[PDB]
């Protein structure tokens, strides 16, 4: 046998920055706690998604040319597959979907909007009227 | 006999759920002013009755 029970390892309140950078490497590790890609399987809410809240606040730029349309989607975590929250028409859908693609780009929809909604907004604009951990694994 | 004939057999679950939507609901009774009886609301109790007093033959 073997035992690797860690109980509640307690919340890691990181909030990394690279908002100016990438569009996919804009995940993977930023994933590991997010997805444009990473963790699904009927459980990982917008929640830990937030955290980072791309606390870097918002949008920025693009790698290729598929501009004039997005703010971003699919693959986040929890039930209906993977999870997200779609695009720009949803800049509207409650609060705005920037490179927070990743997080407040996933998110603004009323339903993961269940997933408490409850961890984000232009809150995430680094005021996030709160407190986190400002080494924030900047890297 | 004609067309809508039970495709398959229903489950006891859904059976007594369909049943579950009907928990037998109790009636309503308030006391009579100057007696001991639970008359239905607004209604005069069989005996006693209302103000002015009438009937009084429900032994």
């Amino acid at each position: 046998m073997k035992t690797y029970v860690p109980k509640q390892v307690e919340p890691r309140w990181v909030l990394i920055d690279a908002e100016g950078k990438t569009l996919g490497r804009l995940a993977t590790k930023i994933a590991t706690l997010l997805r444009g890609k990473h963790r699904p399987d009927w459980t990982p809410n917008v929640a830990m998604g937030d955290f980072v809240v791309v606390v870097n606040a918002d949008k920025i730029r693009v790698t290729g040319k598929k501009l004039e349309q997005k703010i971003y989607t699919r693959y986040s975590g929890y039930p209906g597959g993977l999870k997200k929250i779609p695009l720009e028409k949803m800049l509207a859908t409650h609060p705005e979907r920037v490179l927070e693609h990743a997080v407040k780009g996933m998110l603004p929809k009323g339903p993961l909007g269940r997933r408490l909604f409850k961890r984000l907004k232009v809150y995430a604009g680094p005021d996030h009227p709160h407190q986190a951990q400002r080494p924030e694994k900047l890297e | 006999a004609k067309h809508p004939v039970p495709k398959k057999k229903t489950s006891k679950a859904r059976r007594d759920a369909r049943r579950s939507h009907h928990a037998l609901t109790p009636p309503t009774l308030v006391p009579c002013p100057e007696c001991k009886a639970m008359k239905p609301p607004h209604t005069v109790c069989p005996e006693c009755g209302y103000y002015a007093g009438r009937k009084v033959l429900e032994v």
Binding site: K2, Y4, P6 | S11, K12
Partner: protein, 117 residues
């Protein structure tokens, strides 16, 4: 001679029945159904013997890799670090004396780095 078919049937019947008790559905209230679902359950059990082993392989690999990330490098490097040097065993799982005891962990990390760097 008439062999009065008596309780043999009912006994193996309620043998399988007894095996069933713990499920939902009329399977957990029918004989011929319990039976079949139990067959399926057995298949599942074997599958999950071998696959228990393999999914364990998965988790081992995972948290060893994640610890490796939390420090410096990653998995593949880790492995050739052990494998090349000479340490031909470790039982990957046994390395889970890692977060449980980060000390010996860090040192052995330096082993893998040492004899393969």
């Amino acid at each position: 001679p008439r062999a009065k078919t008596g309780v043999v049937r009912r006994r193996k019947h309620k043998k399988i029945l007894k095996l069933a008790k713990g499920y939902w559905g009329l399977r957990s209230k029918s004989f011929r159904k319990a039976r079949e679902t139990l067959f399926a359950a057995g298949n599942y059990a074997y599958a999950h013997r071998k696959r228990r082993k393999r999914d364990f392989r998965r988790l081992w690999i995972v948290r060893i890799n994640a610890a490796c990330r939390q420090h410096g490098l990653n998995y593949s490097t880790f492995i050739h670090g052990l494998k090349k040097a000479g340490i031909e065993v470790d039982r990957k799982n046994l390395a889970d004396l890692a977060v449980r005891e980060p000390q010996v962990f860090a040192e052995l990390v330096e082993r893998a780095k040492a004899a393969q760097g």
